Amino acid sequence: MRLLHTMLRVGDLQRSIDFYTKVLGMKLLRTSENPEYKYSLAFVGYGPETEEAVIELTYNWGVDKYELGTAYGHIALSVDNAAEACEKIRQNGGNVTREAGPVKGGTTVIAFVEDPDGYKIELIEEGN
Amino acid sequence: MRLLHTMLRVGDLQRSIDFYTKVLGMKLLRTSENPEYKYSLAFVGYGPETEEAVIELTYNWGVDKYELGTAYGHIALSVDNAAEACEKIRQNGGNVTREAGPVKGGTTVIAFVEDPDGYKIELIEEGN
Ligand SMILES: [Zn+2]
Ligand SMILES: [Zn+2]
């Protein structure tokens, strides 16, 4: 058994794809449409779905906003360069909610940002 | 870069821990408590944090209820037998919302369930 993906509903498919890929470094793995039910999906990740967990973005035709709620927390992603990522995010449609810097009571550099739909993203500058 | 984890706030830490480990077959990877911010965490997954994406269960002291909202979708997990998992889940603190069965215009077997806090979980099955 394995963790496959986390699904998030977004207000604008392409805008989200653009964000995850161009800003966060992910790749568009596949996309699909469902005419019957009027929704489109996009899977974004850092590697193949067969090997790792990815993100499933759902766009319901004609729906551009949802109620975020208080239950869902965030998704944490490893980051190559936290400071730089924050910059890219700042200038590329996102918000930086916690500037890059050592975590409290630690040395590991972390940051918090928001995607285009306001979803919280935690960035962690991390056998063999 | 990689997907590290998906964080979800839960109303009862042990209740969630029990569900993810005993029912879903995950392992309790680690726990922590933070007196300043008043919360406790539990990381559950199918593999170590260095190898896979996991779930971060967050319990805010004295907070037993949240608003799920309509934005967050779900987490998808692979299972050896969707039907068996559904029955185990329905009898152990969970709820089956979509009985195990093939996807319309498909052969892939899937089911949708809910955890103890109402979080949606998609189960995707991997000559009787
Ligand atoms: Zn986290
Ligand atoms: Zn899904």
From Swiss-Prot, chains A, B:
Disulfide bonds, paired cysteine numbers: none
Instruction: Quote the catalytic activity from the record.
Output: (R)-S-lactoylglutathione = methylglyoxal + glutathione
Query: How cofactor binds (record note)?
Result: Binds 1 nickel ion per subunit. In the homodimer, two nickel ions are bound between subunits. Is not active with zinc ions.
Per the UniProt entry, the Enzyme Commission number(s) are 4.4.1.5
| GO MF terms, alphabetically ordered | lactoylglutathione lyase activity; nickel cation binding; protein homodimerization activity
Q: Which residues bind Ni(2+)?
A: 5, 56, 74, 122
Q: Please state, per the UniProt record, what induces or represses the expression of this protein.
A: Repressed by NemR. Induced by reactive electrophilic species (RES) such as quinones, glyoxals and methylglyoxal. Up-regulated by HOCl.
Q: Give the pathway listed in the UniProt entry for this protein.
A: Secondary metabolite metabolism; methylglyoxal degradation; (R)-lactate from methylglyoxal: step 1/2
Q: Which residues form the active site?
A: 122
- Keyword Lyase present in the record's keywords: the answer is yes
Q: Name one GO biological process term.
A: response to toxic substance
Q: Which co-factor is required?
A: Ni(2+)
Listed under GO cellular component are:
cytoplasm; cytosol
Q: Which residues bind substrate?
A: 9, 60, 74
Q: What class of enzyme is it?
A: lyase
Under InterPro entries, the record lists: Glyas_Bleomycin-R_OHBP_Dase, Glyas_Fos-R_dOase_dom, Glyoxalase_1, Glyoxalase_1_CS, VOC
Q: Which family does it belong to?
A: Belongs to the glyoxalase I family.
Q: Which NCBIfam families does the annotation name?
A: glyox_I, PRK10291.1
Subunit description: Homodimer.
What is the protein's given name? Answer: Lactoylglutathione lyase
- Which species is listed as the source? Escherichia coli (strain K12)
